[PDB]
From Swiss-Prot, chain A:
Present with 573 molecules/cell in log phase SD medium. There are 2 genes for eS4 in yeast. Keywords: Cytoplasm, Isopeptide bond, Phosphoprotein, Ribonucleoprotein, Ribosomal protein, RNA-binding, rRNA-binding, Ubl conjugation. HAMAP family: Ribosomal_eS4. It holds the Pfam family KOW. This is Small ribosomal subunit protein eS4A. It is found in: Cytoplasm. It comes from Saccharomyces cerevisiae (strain ATCC 204508 / S288c) (Baker's yeast). Belongs to the eukaryotic ribosomal protein eS4 family. The modification Phosphothreonine is found at residue 103. Component of the small ribosomal subunit (SSU). Mature yeast ribosomes consist of a small (40S) and a large (60S) subunit. The 40S small subunit contains 1 molecule of ribosomal RNA (18S rRNA) and 33 different proteins (encoded by 57 genes). The large 60S subunit contains 3 rRNA molecules (25S, 5.8S and 5S rRNA) and 46 different proteins (encoded by 81 genes).
Swiss-Prot record, chain B:
One of its GO terms (biological process) is maturation of SSU-rRNA. Residues 78-134 are annotated as: Disordered. This is U3 small nucleolar ribonucleoprotein protein LCP5. Keywords: Acetylation, Nucleus, Ribonucleoprotein, Ribosome biogenesis, rRNA processing. It comes from Saccharomyces cerevisiae (strain ATCC 204508 / S288c). Present with 1430 molecules/cell in log phase SD medium. The keyword Ribonucleoprotein applies.
Swiss-Prot record, chain C:
Keywords: Acetylation, Cytoplasm, Isopeptide bond, Ribonucleoprotein, Ribosomal protein, RNA-binding, rRNA-binding, Ubl conjugation. The lineage of its organism: Eukaryota, Fungi, Dikarya, Ascomycota, Saccharomycotina. GO terms for biological process: maturation of SSU-rRNA from tricistronic rRNA transcript (SSU-rRNA, 5.8S rRNA, LSU-rRNA); ribosomal small subunit assembly; translation. It comes from Saccharomyces cerevisiae (strain ATCC 204508 / S288c). Pfam families: Ribosomal_S17, Ribosomal_S17_N. One of its GO terms (molecular function) is rRNA binding. Component of the ribosome, a large ribonucleoprotein complex responsible for the synthesis of proteins in the cell. The small ribosomal subunit (SSU) binds messenger RNAs (mRNAs) and translates the encoded message by selecting cognate aminoacyl-transfer RNA (tRNA) molecules. The large subunit (LSU) contains the ribosomal catalytic site termed the peptidyl transferase center (PTC), which catalyzes the formation of peptide bonds, thereby polymerizing the amino acids delivered by tRNAs into a polypeptide chain. This is Small ribosomal subunit protein uS17A. It comes from the Eukaryota. GO terms for cellular component: 90S preribosome; cytosol; cytosolic small ribosomal subunit. N-terminally acetylated by acetyltransferase NatA. There is a cross-link at residues 8, 26, 36-37, 59, 76, 85, 113, 121 (Glycyl lysine isopeptide (Lys-Gly) (interchain with G-Cter in ubiquitin)).
UniProtKB/Swiss-Prot annotation, chain D:
Belongs to the eukaryotic ribosomal protein eS8 family. This is Small ribosomal subunit protein eS8A. The gene is RPS8A. Its main location: cytoplasm. PANTHER family: 40S RIBOSOMAL PROTEIN S8 (PTHR10394). The modification Phosphoserine is found at residues 65, 68, 72, 85, 124-125, 128, 131. It is found in: Cytoplasm. InterPro entries: Ribosomal_eS8, Ribosomal_eS8_CS, Ribosomal_protein_eS8_euk, Ribosomal_Se8/biogenesis_NSA2. GO terms for molecular function: structural constituent of ribosome. Present with 15900 molecules/cell in log phase SD medium. There are 2 genes for eS8 in yeast. The keyword Signal does not apply. It comes from Saccharomyces cerevisiae (strain ATCC 204508 / S288c) (Baker's yeast).
Length: 229, 134, 123, 166, 591
RNA sequence: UACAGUGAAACUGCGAAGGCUCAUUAAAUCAGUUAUCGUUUAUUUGAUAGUUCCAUGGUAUAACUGUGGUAAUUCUAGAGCUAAUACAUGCUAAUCUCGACCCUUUGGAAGAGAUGUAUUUAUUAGAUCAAUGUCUUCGGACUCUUUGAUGAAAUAACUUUUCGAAUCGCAUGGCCUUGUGCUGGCGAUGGUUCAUUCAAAUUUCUGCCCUAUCAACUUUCGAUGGUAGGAUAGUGGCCUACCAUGGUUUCAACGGGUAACGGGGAAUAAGGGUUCGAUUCCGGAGAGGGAGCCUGAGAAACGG
């Protein structure tokens, strides 16, 4: 019943928490109860995890946002004050939720995949991300599946990382939740098995879907750091 | 056709080809020692159990390490225990003599047909078998 | 081209570029046709996914019944069974399709009970 | 109407043995409340939360647009002469969408006389009806979903377009 | 209650004229002040009193927009609105600078004048004001400081009211009273006068015929000031001519031209200004350009000089006679200016029009022989006619060919100005050869042969209309000269023009081999025709783009070979567009 | 001596927010998946409100009192007051640009255009030029070359038309208009619209029985399609007029089963139990039985 992404061990209980409404999806989010409680273990149970969320130490997306089933999904920059626990959370190679530690420099920003640019009302330029960052007045060349950079103090798009040929990609979807390397090919169809394909250590080639993909940076220079091992 | 996510297609099952015969040979010919216990602390109900099996002591190590790793005593969930614990102690007291289980020699499971005789690297060409030998 | 009542008029002649690999004919851009449900102008919007295949029957007006055979390496009987499919499709005045006549179409906006597709390109 | 579903009526293959389901809420096949002539009376039906919807029943004050200048002015309603989505519709003279109804057009007349000065560029097939007063006009807005009587006057091509038919 | 007020003004028209006038007289008498202000000026008012006349003007404006048919016009209401304007002027002018109530009263003054001028717009030839003297006096006292104050691209209170007074015939009593056209021509001839100056000149043009037709000598002096204003603001109609309406300038120049023609400087400026529509841009309308040319000739027949106006009209004749559009209409205007420039060269232009343009017979075929036997030395219109017959024309094709050959002989007879004219002949011959011409491109090749009179022998070998052995001999002769940017581009474009991918004969692959071999022989020249090879290979890329993918693909594959040979002989360059071309081919590869 | 702590009965905010029995539904149930610019969406989350002519708005009614009826219910009849974040009427600074004129740096005065939102009707804004170069006349006409860009909701009206703060807190704090004269720094809830989340319904595709003694089916709840009307959250023959004779199938239509108390990966796997062995749902209903209405972001309500 409990999803694979949170690394919920089967030794949990009986009932798994359904994460509520928020910025992110149902399948692409782990709430703060399963984050703090049994992933990096700053609380032991529901009582004291509600106690620390009422003590209000957390600054996910730079705000407190006190709720257990608050769906803090992909790359919501978690920030906890006591000994500066700064965590940007990504996917690992098997679909789970990795939590890469950052510092205050990397915690002063994040990115977002654009989902549509519309001309709704009063002629205002328009961009929404996965976390609903309705940010005002970009360059008019915000294309489909492009990437904006969020200031995390304001909302303003400070940098703009394009979805095009020769940029380091991310994938959230397919049989391939979360791989990196993006250079064998760009095979663009018109709606199905349409993607930029990804390499490996032996430089293999993989197939994914287009809106199940965004850009993280450039091949050889991402400033959004990645862990190792 | 199209791509579907599947945890059962990249999940650590890893129990379809573990056989106690093979692991017993690997433990014999490993040349790394094996962390046995002090010799009294392994028998259980003052003897009324077995000693205890190797699967039992690894599972018990997992339960107490999960215990000391996230601070939680388990329960007496009755459907689960009324199946698994009574069936566990009953197969233990039928098959496990002296702390060593002997049910692996009285149970049909083909050793070669899951554990040896590799499947992907089956070498279905003579060129492939010559290259992989040399 | 005014047979039926109720002020056949356009909807706001007016034209649009469907695009996405589907070229619209200039006669449909600025002609006399009402252009009510072509993917090029119409009132519909194209979306979804695309299909390809020949046709069998174009007897009624604004019906194109498209045949779709697809290949699949079946390992059950270790052989292949020949695929066949059918679905009606609305017209668009580009090339008048008889028996044969491969067409690609795209998913859009239900018109009658069994059609979600409208012709964009013929060969 | 009763429902809106492909279960109780057959598909293209003509399958049998239905016994499908008991009908649910979202197939609320409402009563058609056909608008007629009277004094303005509307029903505010309730659906999908705070979704009010005006079903017009006796609205008279027609908001019709001079189409060649797009001036939506406010007149009366006399009667239909053509709507063969049902051959009963012209006989019982109801009021719905895409209906051409006759209108005493003195507000349009005085807008012509207030921007122009002269009384009667334009067709004589509408000049005889400017001399008359009674014009032909097609209602485009939905009395059953929008709850008004909004339409466009007929001038020239559309006038003769309905006139050659009837 | 605002939407209720819209409903009130909407349904205030179902009453009669007597009821409307009684309601208007009741609305006027709430804020009339007519014992105190209907003689000279307003004696006293407050913020509350200045708001009552402001709302009187507000209801007056809404009543004007509703009943713009009569508006219930009355002398009491006119005197009351004049009292309101005078009261707002007095309060706003002598009230001290606090700017709050003064700004409200300055907004009420513009909106009150808008309530007044709407009667002049909607009740124009219905009111027929005989009592205009007091209101015109207060109007001059209001807008005496409106020289350039109401002058901009959107200031339209005094502009609109003066247009209402000016664009009628009998409304100009207040124009001939003291001054209207003074302010209008000041706003027109301002130094940076904005895009409403065209409408100011439009109001002056609409008032000039009124000042002509009126029986007053004051209106005659106003028409004298109209001619003086048109001659004084001639650069306003050039600096505000960034919009499409040059026909309005042509129709104002013709009306003033049928009014008067004054001096040689007026003729010089008017010739140069109607000539600006032939010597500035090409985006004028058909009747606009023909009317401007006929009016330039109608002023040149009026007061033109002998050298400079002849030069302007001769440049116009040389441009328009080789243009020759509008089914001999612009050519008829060019012939009119040709006879009307009034010189010996103008007489030659008139004769070269007269013998050649006699209405779609063998008249041009007789005039070609007449000019070949009696070619003059002015030759502007003659070379115009000898290039226009050299163009894609029906008759006198070989006659224009013989005229061009005798023209090259005349170039060798004069030999440097007739070799400077050959530069224009070359830059027009390339423009004719790079087209769909058949007889004209062959006559341009005959002009190349006559100018080049081994090269001319290979030209006589190629010009045989066989083009299999002849095109093979063209490839072999180009290879003989192989074993010149525009000249090699001319020969290659002539090859591509005679073999322009037209699928009605074979050996087009060997013809493409001939064109690409001539391109490669020019491409061996790495110092001079490098831009020629660059433009040719870019044109092969553009032809590989523009709907032809079977000929220009092999053409680009042959174009790359001289590049690879020159790079092999190199064993720096502009590889940025080369990587762009590799990326463009990679874009075409998966597509 | 207009409110003061416990405090028997009421409304409010919320609660019960998910469970029995019977006949046996074959990719129509169900799952994965595309879309919804075809659409309803409380909640979560992100943004986002300028049309004022000669010191704060009226009664109707509970609780409360009082007289009574009935064998009698959270059954009732008169009479009296009393106040509401209850009905429902009405009080609200001058601020945005082009900048005739400049006096040179502290640079802005004259004139003009101004200023929301929602419901449904129509025209519409949504082919140009700059260089690194063809000619160089060491000057320019320049987009066919080499590339580069705005780019193939403003107006004329309807409407029993919504609001521009009667919420609370942290803060005495500034300026002399000689007094709450101007208060003024700050945060949450307000509130229109849009987006997002979640959810709902429709939609293309994908998924183990035998099947021809089931070979023809489908117009005998319209069969297949157009055009229009209705109503729907909307598209939609989902119902209605007129019109065409359609549409599928031997490449298996339609039609007939059990071990469909068993099955469909629906899924925990258990380190040897080799189909026993964990879980989602058998199908759809019903609250005595059909029939008709209403409620709500969601209901044809387990509790109207």
């Amino acid at each position: 019943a409990a999803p694979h992404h949170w690394l919920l061990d089967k030794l949990s209980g009986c009932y798994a928490p359904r994460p509520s409404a928020g910025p992110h999806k149902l399948r692409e989010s782990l709430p703060l109860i399963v984050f703090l409680r049994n992933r990096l273990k700053y609380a032991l149970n529901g009582r004291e995890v509600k106690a620390i969320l009422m003590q209000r130490h957390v600054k996910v997306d730079g705000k407190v946002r006190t709720d257990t089933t608050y769906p803090a999904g992909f790359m919501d920059v978690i920030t906890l004050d006591a000994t500066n626990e700064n965590f940007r959370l990504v996917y690992d190679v098997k679909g789970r939720f990795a939590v890469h530690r950052i510092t205050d420099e990397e915690a002063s920003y994040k990115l977002g995949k654009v989902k549509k640019v519309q001309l709704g009302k009063k002629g205002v330029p328009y961009v929404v991300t996965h976390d609903g960052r309705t940010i005002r007045y970009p360059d008019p060349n915000i294309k489909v599946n492009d990437t904006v950079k969020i200031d995390l103090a304001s909302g303003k798009i400070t940098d703009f990382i394009k979805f095009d040929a020769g940029k380091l990609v991310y994938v959230t979807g397919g049989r391939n939740l979360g791989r990196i390397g993006t250079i064998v090919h760009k095979e663009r169809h018109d709606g199905g098995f349409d993607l930029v394909h990804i390499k490996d250590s032996l430089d293999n080639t993989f197939v994914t879907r287009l809106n199940n993909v965004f850009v993280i940076g450039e091949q050889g220079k991402p400033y959004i750091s990645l862990p190792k091992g | 056709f199209e791509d579907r996510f599947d945890a059962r297609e990249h999940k650590d099952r890893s129990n379809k080809s573990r056989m106690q015969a093979m692991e017993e040979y690997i433990r014999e010919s490993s040349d790394q020692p094996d962390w046995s216990a002090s010799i009294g602390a392994d028998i259980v109900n003052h003897g009324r159990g077995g000693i205890k099996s190797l699967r039992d002591t690894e599972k018990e190590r997992r339960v107490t390490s999960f215990e000391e790793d996230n601070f939680t005593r388990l329960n007496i969930t009755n459907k689960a225990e009324k199946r698994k614990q009574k069936q566990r102690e009953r197969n233990a007291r039928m098959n496990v003599i002296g702390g060593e289980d002997f049910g692996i020699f009285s149970s049909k499971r083909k050793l070669e047909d899951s554990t040896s005789r590799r499947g992907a690297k089956k070498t279905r060409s003579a060129w492939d078998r010559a290259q992989r030998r040399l | 081209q005014s047979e039926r009542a109720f002020q056949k008029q356009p909807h706001i002649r007016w034209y649009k570029n469907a695009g996405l690999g589907f070229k619209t004919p200039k006669t449909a851009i600025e002609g006399s046709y009402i252009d009510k449900k072509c993917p090029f102008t119409g009132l519909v919007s194209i979306r979804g996914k695309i299909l390809t295949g020949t046709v069998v029957s174009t007897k009624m007006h604004r019906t194109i019944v498209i045949r779709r055979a697809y290949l699949h390496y079946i390992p059950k009987y270790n052989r292949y069974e020949k695929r066949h499919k059918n679905v009606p499709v609305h017209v668009s005045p580009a090339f008048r399709v008889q028996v044969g006549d491969i067409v690609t179409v795209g998913q859009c906006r239900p018109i009658s009970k069994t059609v979600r597709f409208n012709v964009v390109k013929v060969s | 109407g009763i429902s809106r579903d492909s279960r109780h009526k057959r598909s293209a293959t003509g399958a049998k043995r239905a016994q499908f389901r008991k009908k649910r809420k979202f197939e609320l096949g409402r009563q058609p409340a056909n608008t007629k002539i009277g004094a303005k009376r509307i029903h505010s039906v309730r659906t999908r939360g705070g979704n009010k919807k005006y079903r017009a029943l006796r609205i008279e004050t027609g908001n019709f647009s001079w189409a060649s200048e797009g001036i939506s002015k406010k007149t009366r309603i006399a009667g239909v002469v053509y709507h063969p989505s049902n051959n009963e519709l012209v006989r019982t003279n109801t009021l719905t969408k895409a209906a051409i109804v006759q209108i005493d057009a003195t507000p349009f007349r005085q807008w012509f006389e207030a921007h122009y000065g002269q009384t009667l560029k334009i067709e004589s097939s509408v000049e005889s009806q400017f001399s008359a007063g009674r014009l032909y006009a097609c209602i485009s807005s939905r009395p059953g979903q929008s709850g008004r009587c909004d339409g466009y006057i007929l001038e020239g091509e559309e006038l003769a377009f309905y006139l050659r038919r009837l | 209650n605002g939407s209720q007020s819209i409903k009130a003004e909407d349904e205030k028209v179902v009453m009669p004229y007597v009821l409307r006038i009684f309601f208007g007289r009741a609305q006027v008498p709430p804020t009339s002040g007519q014992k105190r202000s209907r003689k000279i000026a307003v004696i006293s008012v407050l913020p509350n009193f200045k708001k009552p006349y402001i709302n009187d003007f507000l209801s007056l404006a809404s009543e004007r927009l509703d009943y713009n048919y009569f508006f219930g016009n009355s002398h009491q209401i006119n005197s009351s609105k004049a009292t309101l304007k005078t009261i707002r002027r007095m309060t706003g002018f002598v009230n001290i600078v606090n700017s709050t109530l003064s700004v409200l009263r300055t907004n009420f003054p513009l909106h009150t004048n808008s309530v007044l001028q709407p009667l002049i717009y909607s009740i124009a030839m219905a009111y027929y004001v005989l009592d205009t003297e007091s209101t015109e006096e207060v109007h001059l006292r209001k807008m005496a400081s409106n020289l350039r104050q109401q002058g901009l691209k959107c200031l339209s209170s005094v502009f609109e009211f003066v247009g209402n007074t000016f664009d009628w015939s009998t409304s100009m009593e207040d124009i001939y009273a003291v001054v209207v056209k003074p302010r209008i021509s000041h706003f027109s001839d301002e130094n940076l006068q904005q895009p409403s100056s065209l409408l100011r000149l439009f109001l002056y043009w609409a008032h000039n015929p009124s000042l002509y037709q009126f029986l007053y000598y004051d209106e005659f002096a106003t028409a004298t000031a109209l001619m003086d204003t048109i001659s004084n603001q001639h650069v306003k109609e050039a600096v505000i001519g960034p919009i499409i309406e040059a026909a309005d300038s042509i129709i104002r120049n013709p009306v003033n031209d049928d009014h008067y023609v004054d001096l040689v400087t007026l003729i010089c400026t008017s010739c140069l200004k109607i000539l600006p529509s032939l010597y500035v841009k090409l985006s004028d309308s058909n009747s606009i350009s023909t009317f401007l040319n006929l009016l330039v000739s109608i002023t040149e027949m009026g007061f033109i000089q002998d050298d400079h106006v002849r030069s302007r009209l001769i440049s116009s004749l040389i441009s328009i006679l080789k243009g020759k559009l509008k089914k001999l209409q612009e050519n008829d205007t060019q012939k009119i200016l040709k006879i009307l420039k009034l010189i010996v060269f103008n007489y030659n232009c008139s004769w070269s029009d007269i013998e050649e343009l006699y209405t779609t017979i063998s008249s041009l075929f007789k005039t070609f022989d007449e000019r070949n036997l009696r070619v003059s030395l002015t030759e502007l219109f003659i070379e115009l006619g000898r290039k226009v017959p050299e163009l894609e024309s029906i008759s006198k094709l070989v006659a224009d060919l013989n005229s061009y050959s005798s023209s090259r002989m005349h170039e060798y007879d004069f030999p440097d100005f007739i070799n400077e004219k050959p530069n224009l002949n070359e830059a027009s011959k390339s423009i004719s050869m790079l087209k769909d011409i058949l007889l004209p491109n062959i006559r341009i090749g005959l002009r190349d042969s006559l100018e080049e009179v081994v090269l001319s022998y290979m030209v006589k070998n190629t010009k045989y209309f066989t083009d299999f052995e002849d095109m093979a001999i063209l490839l072999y002769n180009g290879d003989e000269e192989a074993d010149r940017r525009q000249r090699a581009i001319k020969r290659l474009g002539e090859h591509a023009h005679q073999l322009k991918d037209n699928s009605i004969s074979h050996y087009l692959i060997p013809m493409i081999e001939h064109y690409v071999f001539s391109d490669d022989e020019r491409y061996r020249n790495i110092g001079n025709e490098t831009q020629i090879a660059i433009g040719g290979l870019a044109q092969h890329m553009s032809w590989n783009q523009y709907k032809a993918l079977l000929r220009r693909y092999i053409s680009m594959l042959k174009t790359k070979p001289n590049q690879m040979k020159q790079a092999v002989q190199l064993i720096t360059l502009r590889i940025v567009r080369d990587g762009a071309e590799s990326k463009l081919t990679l874009s075409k590869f998966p597509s």
